[PDB]
Design a protein around this nucleic acid. Structure first.
Ligand SMILES: Nc1nc(C[C@H]2C[C@H](O)[C@@H](COP(=O)(O)OP(=O)(O)OP(=O)(O)O)O2)c(NC=O)c(=O)[nH]1
Ligand SMILES: [Ca+2]
Ligand SMILES: [Ca+2]
Ligand SMILES: [Ca+2]
Ligand code: NA
Ligand code: NA
Ligand code: NA
Ligand code: NA
Ligand code: NA
Length: 320
DNA sequence: CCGACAGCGCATCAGC
DNA sequence: GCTGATGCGC
DNA sequence: GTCGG
């Protein structure tokens, strides 16, 4: 295994994102951690690791130091830095990003209690993130996701039989647990060339006391909180997103939001090699000089695989 | 050597 | 009142 | 921090 290395790299990633405000270093560290986590041998040297794409000179050196000492001095200094620790912690609140965390810590607001004492300094999203701080960090067992899917699919049908709703994310690929629930919604009345379609669904889910809180809500995206009904101890509150997509872009959306991200990458690269470009909304043909044509008609995920002459992959086999 | 690294919907705010 | 920038999360 | 033009 290599859990020591990947943990180190993930801790560095979070430092770069939250304290340094260096999103590309965060992603570099994450990329390195992901390739190493997938590698099938306990790494013995930085040089060994550097053969992996995304591992370069600096991470190789850190791996050598970790392997020889069991720690990383850089990290030890970071862990001991009270300001970096406080900023890092605060960003665990949903809605508190690196900018708000630093600002809070600058004026002595460092702990959950400080936030609770200063709730007037929080915006709506941040107040909800604080409210469900522990709940949002729990994962969702598939059994509960299954029960949540039932409620969402049933309530959407009650509003209008011609809504189509798909629960995507790792759950759709068959994951044993999920971090949140991602619902993609469409309706034949809503296309690229074409009121309250999302609102009526959100409202119905509120009226049945499934949706408990709203982080943000517009005409095409809802971000909020939900909870399964209990008999017993109550269930944790869960993040749920519902995205309203035009029907002619729906299956491209289902494809994208199902992932995995690695899978999307490889599928887009294969599409190109066949003269097509796929993004979150459309698949378009590429001309001989590389000009994208008009979007192609898509009535199913399968249609997309067909265009690029790929055998349809079950969502279950889309980890890569 | 050095620019790219994903980018968009919603909430919020500074500026007009 | 509005627009455009930006933080934020995904 | 890493990669590739
Ligand atoms: N995680 C993530 N997702 C998206 C949207 C797309 C791309 C990703 O391949 C697909 C699945 O993302 P998701 O957040 O569901 O991660 P998931 O794969 O579900 O893991 P889990 O945490 O176990 O539920 O949604 C992002 N971009 C835009 O939504 C993003 O920044 N982060
Ligand atoms: Ca998700
Ligand atoms: Ca996720
Ligand atoms: Ca709870
Ligand atoms: Na946060
Ligand atoms: Na029907
Ligand atoms: Na989450
Ligand atoms: Na080729
Ligand atoms: Na380039």
């Amino acid at each position: 295994l290599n859990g020591g290395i990947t943990d180190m790299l993930t801790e560095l990633a979070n430092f770069e994102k939250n304290v340094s405000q260096a999103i590309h270093k965060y992603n570099a560290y994450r990329k390195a951690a992901s390739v190493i986590a997938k590698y099938p041998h306990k790494i013995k040297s930085g040089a060994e690791a550097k053969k992996l794409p995304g591992v370069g000179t600096k991470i190789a050196e850190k791996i050598d130091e970790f392997l020889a000492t069991g720690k990383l001095r850089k990290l030890e200094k970071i862990r001991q830095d009270d300001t970096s620790s406080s900023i890092n912690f605060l960003t665990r609140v949903s809605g508190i990003g690196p900018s708000a965390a630093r600002k809070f810590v600058d004026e002595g607001i460092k702990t959950l209690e400080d936030l609770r004492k200063n709730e007037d300094k929080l915006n709506h999203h941040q107040r909800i993130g604080l409210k469900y701080f522990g709940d949002f960090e729990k994962r969702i067992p598939r059994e509960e996701m299954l029960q949540m899917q039932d409620i969402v699919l049933n309530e959407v049908k009650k509003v209008d039989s011609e809504y189509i709703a798909t629960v995507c994310g790792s759950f759709r690929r068959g994951a044993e647990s999920s971090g949140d629930m991602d619902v993609l919604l469409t309706h034949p009345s809503f296309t690229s060339e074409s009121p309250k379609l999302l609102h009526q669904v959100v409202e119905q889910l509120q009226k049945v006391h499934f949706i408990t809180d709203t982080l943000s809500k517009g005409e095409t995206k809802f971000m909020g909180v939900c909870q399964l009904p209990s008999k017993e101890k109550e269930y944790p509150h869960r993040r749920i997103d519902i995205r309203l997509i035009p029907k002619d872009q729906y299956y491209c959306g289902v494809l994208y939001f199902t992932g995995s991200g690695i899978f999307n990458k490889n599928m887009r690269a294969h599409a190109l090699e066949k003269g097509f470009t796929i993004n979150e909304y459309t698949i378009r043909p590429l001309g001989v000089t590389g000009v994208a044509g008009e979007p192609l008609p898509v009535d199913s995920e399968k249609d997309i695989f067909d265009y690029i002459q790929w055998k349809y992959r079950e969502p279950k086999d889309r980890s890569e």
